[PDB]
Design an enzyme around this catalytic site. Structure first.
Site, PDB file in Angstrom:
ATOM      1  N   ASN A  98       0.706  -1.215   0.155  1.00  0.00           N
ATOM      2  CA  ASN A  98      -0.011  -0.632  -0.092  1.00  0.00           C
ATOM      3  C   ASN A  98       0.967   1.089  -0.218  1.00  0.00           C
ATOM      4  O   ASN A  98       2.106   1.378   0.195  1.00  0.00           O
ATOM      5  CB  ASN A  98      -1.206   0.230   1.158  1.00  0.00           C
ATOM      6  CG  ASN A  98      -0.343   0.558   2.776  1.00  0.00           C
ATOM      7  OD1 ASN A  98      -0.368   2.084   3.225  1.00  0.00           O
ATOM      8  ND2 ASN A  98       0.190  -0.365   3.377  1.00  0.00           N
ATOM      9  N   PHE A 129      -1.785   8.413   4.386  1.00  0.00           N
ATOM     10  CA  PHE A 129      -2.056   9.198   5.313  1.00  0.00           C
ATOM     11  C   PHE A 129      -3.320   9.841   4.640  1.00  0.00           C
ATOM     12  O   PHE A 129      -3.954  10.928   4.809  1.00  0.00           O
ATOM     13  CB  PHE A 129      -1.526   9.954   6.409  1.00  0.00           C
ATOM     14  CG  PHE A 129      -0.854   9.555   6.993  1.00  0.00           C
ATOM     15  CD1 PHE A 129      -0.177   8.457   7.213  1.00  0.00           C
ATOM     16  CD2 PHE A 129       0.496   9.847   7.059  1.00  0.00           C
ATOM     17  CE1 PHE A 129      -0.281   7.406   8.575  1.00  0.00           C
ATOM     18  CE2 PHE A 129       1.287   9.772   8.215  1.00  0.00           C
ATOM     19  CZ  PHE A 129       1.497   8.354   8.612  1.00  0.00           C
ATOM     20  N   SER A 146       6.014   5.407   8.938  1.00  0.00           N
ATOM     21  CA  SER A 146       5.000   5.574   7.321  1.00  0.00           C
ATOM     22  C   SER A 146       5.810   4.831   6.418  1.00  0.00           C
ATOM     23  O   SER A 146       6.626   6.462   6.069  1.00  0.00           O
ATOM     24  CB  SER A 146       3.840   5.980   6.816  1.00  0.00           C
ATOM     25  OG  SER A 146       3.112   6.323   5.920  1.00  0.00           O
ATOM     26  N   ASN A 158       5.094   5.988   3.607  1.00  0.00           N
ATOM     27  CA  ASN A 158       4.532   6.562   2.239  1.00  0.00           C
ATOM     28  C   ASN A 158       3.975   8.132   2.353  1.00  0.00           C
ATOM     29  O   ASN A 158       3.152   9.013   2.102  1.00  0.00           O
ATOM     30  CB  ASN A 158       2.988   6.084   1.999  1.00  0.00           C
ATOM     31  CG  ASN A 158       3.582   4.852   1.852  1.00  0.00           C
ATOM     32  OD1 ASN A 158       4.146   4.188   0.870  1.00  0.00           O
ATOM     33  ND2 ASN A 158       2.285   3.426   2.398  1.00  0.00           N
ATOM     34  N   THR A 159       4.808   9.039   3.924  1.00  0.00           N
ATOM     35  CA  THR A 159       4.804  10.273   3.863  1.00  0.00           C
ATOM     36  C   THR A 159       6.134  10.825   3.687  1.00  0.00           C
ATOM     37  O   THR A 159       7.502  10.004   5.004  1.00  0.00           O
ATOM     38  CB  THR A 159       4.381  10.480   4.403  1.00  0.00           C
ATOM     39  OG1 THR A 159       3.022  10.192   4.945  1.00  0.00           O
ATOM     40  CG2 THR A 159       4.209  12.076   5.334  1.00  0.00           C
ATOM     41  N   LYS A 167       5.676   4.331  16.638  1.00  0.00           N
ATOM     42  CA  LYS A 167       5.678   2.839  15.953  1.00  0.00           C
ATOM     43  C   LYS A 167       6.587   3.155  15.210  1.00  0.00           C
ATOM     44  O   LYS A 167       6.797   3.952  14.662  1.00  0.00           O
ATOM     45  CB  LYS A 167       3.855   2.417  15.493  1.00  0.00           C
ATOM     46  CG  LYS A 167       3.856   1.765  14.295  1.00  0.00           C
ATOM     47  CD  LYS A 167       2.252   1.251  13.795  1.00  0.00           C
ATOM     48  CE  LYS A 167       1.911   0.268  12.932  1.00  0.00           C
ATOM     49  NZ  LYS A 167       0.794   0.172  12.772  1.00  0.00           N
ATOM     50  N   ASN A 222       5.778  -1.250  12.238  1.00  0.00           N
ATOM     51  CA  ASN A 222       5.242  -0.580  10.100  1.00  0.00           C
ATOM     52  C   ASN A 222       4.883  -1.622   8.761  1.00  0.00           C
ATOM     53  O   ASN A 222       6.181  -2.698   9.341  1.00  0.00           O
ATOM     54  CB  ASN A 222       5.098   0.480  10.124  1.00  0.00           C
ATOM     55  CG  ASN A 222       3.576   1.801   9.562  1.00  0.00           C
ATOM     56  OD1 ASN A 222       3.508   0.861   8.470  1.00  0.00           O
ATOM     57  ND2 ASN A 222       3.947   2.385  10.296  1.00  0.00           N
TER      58      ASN A 222
HETATM   59  C1  LIG Z   1      -3.028  -0.446   3.774  1.00  0.00           C
HETATM   60  C2  LIG Z   1      -3.074  -1.144   4.466  1.00  0.00           C
HETATM   61  C3  LIG Z   1      -2.747   0.296   5.988  1.00  0.00           C
HETATM   62  C4  LIG Z   1      -1.976   0.759   6.209  1.00  0.00           C
HETATM   63  N1  LIG Z   1      -1.912   1.921   7.419  1.00  0.00           N
HETATM   64  C5  LIG Z   1      -1.810   2.548   8.076  1.00  0.00           C
HETATM   65  C6  LIG Z   1      -1.752   3.306   9.258  1.00  0.00           C
HETATM   66  O1  LIG Z   1      -2.317   4.273   8.424  1.00  0.00           O
HETATM   67  N2  LIG Z   1      -1.229   3.218  10.429  1.00  0.00           N
HETATM   68  C7  LIG Z   1      -0.251   2.828  10.586  1.00  0.00           C
HETATM   69  O2  LIG Z   1       0.244   2.860  11.474  1.00  0.00           O
HETATM   70  N3  LIG Z   1       0.140   1.787  10.409  1.00  0.00           N
HETATM   71  C8  LIG Z   1      -0.832   1.532   9.015  1.00  0.00           C
HETATM   72  N4  LIG Z   1      -0.055  -0.034   8.126  1.00  0.00           N
HETATM   73  C9  LIG Z   1       0.418  -0.901   9.110  1.00  0.00           C
HETATM   74  C10 LIG Z   1      -0.223  -2.075   9.919  1.00  0.00           C
HETATM   75  O3  LIG Z   1      -0.659  -1.051  10.515  1.00  0.00           O
HETATM   76  C11 LIG Z   1       0.409  -3.011   9.733  1.00  0.00           C
HETATM   77  O4  LIG Z   1       1.812  -2.156  10.833  1.00  0.00           O
HETATM   78  C12 LIG Z   1       1.167  -3.692   8.806  1.00  0.00           C
HETATM   79  O5  LIG Z   1       0.590  -4.189   8.089  1.00  0.00           O
HETATM   80  C13 LIG Z   1       1.510  -4.625   9.270  1.00  0.00           C
HETATM   81  O6  LIG Z   1       0.644  -5.843   9.829  1.00  0.00           O
HETATM   82  P1  LIG Z   1       0.033  -6.834   8.768  1.00  0.00           P
HETATM   83  O7  LIG Z   1       1.467  -7.641   8.648  1.00  0.00           O
HETATM   84  O8  LIG Z   1      -0.828  -7.983  10.053  1.00  0.00           O
HETATM   85  O9  LIG Z   1      -0.863  -6.102   8.187  1.00  0.00           O
HETATM   86  C14 LIG Z   1      -1.467  -0.133   7.202  1.00  0.00           C
HETATM   87  C15 LIG Z   1      -1.121  -1.178   6.623  1.00  0.00           C
HETATM   88  C16 LIG Z   1      -1.962  -2.025   5.620  1.00  0.00           C
HETATM   89  C17 LIG Z   1      -2.278  -3.187   4.963  1.00  0.00           C
HETATM   90  O1  LIG Z   2      -1.240   5.621   4.942  1.00  0.00           O
HETATM   91  C1  LIG Z   2      -0.456   5.151   4.184  1.00  0.00           C
HETATM   92  O2  LIG Z   2      -0.299   5.131   3.808  1.00  0.00           O
HETATM   93  C2  LIG Z   2       0.231   3.724   4.965  1.00  0.00           C
HETATM   94  C3  LIG Z   2       1.002   4.565   6.648  1.00  0.00           C
HETATM   95  C4  LIG Z   2       1.163   3.663   7.619  1.00  0.00           C
HETATM   96  O3  LIG Z   2       1.732   4.289   8.954  1.00  0.00           O
HETATM   97  N1  LIG Z   2       1.778   2.335   7.242  1.00  0.00           N
HETATM   98  C5  LIG Z   2       1.312   2.127   5.958  1.00  0.00           C
HETATM   99  O4  LIG Z   2       2.003   1.049   5.399  1.00  0.00           O
HETATM  100  N2  LIG Z   2       0.376   2.873   4.753  1.00  0.00           N
END
Ligand SMILES: Cc1cc2nc3c(=O)[nH]c(=O)nc-3n(C[C@H](O)[C@H](O)[C@H](O)COP(=O)(O)O)c2cc1C
Ligand SMILES: O=C(O)c1cc(=O)[nH]c(=O)[nH]1
Ligand SMILES: Cc1cc(O)n2nc(SCc3cc(Cl)ccc3Cl)nc2n1
Ligand SMILES: [Cl-]
EC number: 1.3.5.2
Length: 354
Positions: free
Chosen positions: A103, A107, A173, A175-176, A213, A242
């Site tokens: 992804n 944000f 993140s 992505n910022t 985080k 993350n």
């Molecule tokens: C589509 C998507 C969006 C995410 N957005 C955020 C986010 O806004 N803030 C954040 O701290 N982590 C974000 N993450 C990271 C997840 O909280 C997590 O740290 C990461 O995906 C690893 O866990 P997983 O393998 O179970 O998905 C996002 C992950 C995914 C897949």
């Molecule tokens: O908004 C997102 O792109 C995002 C935020 C984040 O903390 N981690 C991530 O995988 N995506």
């Protein structure tokens, strides 16, 4: 069957939006949590240690549905101070051959005001949930065009701190632009000092724990620095990790070279090892929420044994659906019994003691 059809029919972002809507409306847990699964950490009781990771419910729309799904705790966000749209589409990609996602949302956020009002509408319901062992975390981000990152996080503490059991300073993140540099020692110390000052200014019953985080891509020096700062400032905990900007050898998905953070199975052991390192660097004295690639009880227990007090998942939900929550819990309970642990608490950091 109903999920993979709707998902083969919908692009991943549309599938996500539908999932949030379905969950928010309570269209979905028989598993009853064992006493073995309760954990006391961060000044709260958690009825089970399996939470929904940030990103699923960015704007706090589905909190109650998520507890209904069987999560022991819910984390919403990331929330930015002002509303913002995030990156242009397409910005999320499935790698089904890898049980992974990439992804680059950037944000997308309704902003603090909208989320504040949404949480306020159910604030006493949440107070009762928290007292019943079902806490709420709020994950804070920063706007794209912000000229003072620390002030963005401070604003988040001020606005949503009073509505949260814990806050997350998301400096990881991918992505910022520039965000992950806030994990550097000097920048982190300055940022977190300000964040903790703001938190400590909240009235006692509205004063959340503060967690940071972190990325799975840090150098040894970065990790050492973070540990030092967390201990120096009395940060309440860490969320580890993350998504990764790495692309591990072996990925098969056609979309593996898309820009963004990678989640799911290929991240799992990189995250576990980061948990292991951070637990050791903090002498086991700093609670860790372990996340990255959890899709089974074994995955959960590996992170717990490495030092996590709690775990989270997201990407597994996108492949296996809601039943994965109960599955992880049931499997975790069975493994804890097999391995001679009285409960989750006994297993936290167990690998470091053998
Ligand atoms: C589509 C998507 C969006 C995410 N957005 C955020 C986010 O806004 N803030 C954040 O701290 N982590 C974000 N993450 C990271 C997840 O909280 C997590 O740290 C990461 O995906 C690893 O866990 P997983 O393998 O179970 O998905 C996002 C992950 C995914 C897949
Ligand atoms: O908004 C997102 O792109 C995002 C935020 C984040 O903390 N981690 C991530 O995988 N995506
Ligand atoms: C980015 C993304 C993509 C995705 O298929 N999903 N799926 C979920 S939860 C799984 C789900 C999918 C559908 Cl289509 C309907 C309900 C549910 Cl719970 N979250 C997601 N996030
Ligand atoms: Cl308030």
């Amino acid at each position: 069957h109903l999920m993979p059809t709707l998902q083969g029919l919908l692009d991943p972002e549309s599938a996500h939006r539908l999932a949030v809507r379905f969950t928010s409306l309570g269209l979905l847990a028989r598993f009853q949590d064992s006493d073995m699964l309760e954990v006391r950490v961060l000044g709260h009781k958690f009825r089970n240690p399996v939470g929904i990771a940030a990103g699923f419910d960015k704007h706090g729309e589905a909190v109650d549905g998520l507890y209904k799904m069987g999560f022991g705790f819910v984390e919403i966000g990331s929330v930015t101070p002002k509303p913002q749209e995030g990156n242009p589409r397409p910005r999320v990609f499935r790698l089904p051959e890898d049980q992974a996602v990439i992804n680059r949302y950037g944000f997308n956020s309704h902003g603090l005001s909208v989320v504040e009002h949404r949480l306020r509408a159910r604030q006493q319901k949440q107070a009762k949930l928290t007292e019943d062992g079902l806490p709420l975390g709020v994950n804070l981000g920063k706007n794209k065009t912000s000229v003072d990152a620390a002030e963005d996080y401070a604003e988040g503490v001020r606005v949503l701190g009073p509505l949260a059991d814990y806050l997350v300073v998301n400096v990881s993140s991918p992505n910022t632009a520039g965000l992950r540099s806030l994990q550097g020692k000097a920048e982190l110390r300055r940022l977190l000092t300000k964040v903790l000052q703001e938190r400590d200014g909240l009235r006692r019953v509205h004063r959340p724990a503060v967690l940071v985080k972190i990325a799975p891509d840090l150098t040894s020096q970065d990790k050492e620095d973070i540990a030092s700062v967390v201990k120096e400032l009395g940060i309440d905990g860490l969320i580890v990790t993350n998504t990764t900007v790495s692309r591990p050898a072996g990925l098969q998905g056609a979309l593996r070279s898309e820009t963004g953070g990678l989640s799911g199975k290929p991240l799992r052991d990189l995250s576990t090892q980061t948990i292991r390192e951070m637990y050791a660097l903090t002498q086991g004295r700093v609670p860790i929420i372990g996340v990255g690639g959890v899709s089974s009880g074994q995955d959960a227990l590996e992170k717990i044994r490495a030092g996590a007090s709690l775990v989270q998942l997201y990407t597994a939900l996108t492949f296996w659906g809601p039943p994965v929550v109960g599955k992880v819990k049931r499997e975790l309970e069975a493994l804890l019994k097999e391995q001679g642990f009285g409960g989750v608490t006994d297993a936290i950091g167990a690998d470091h003691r053998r």
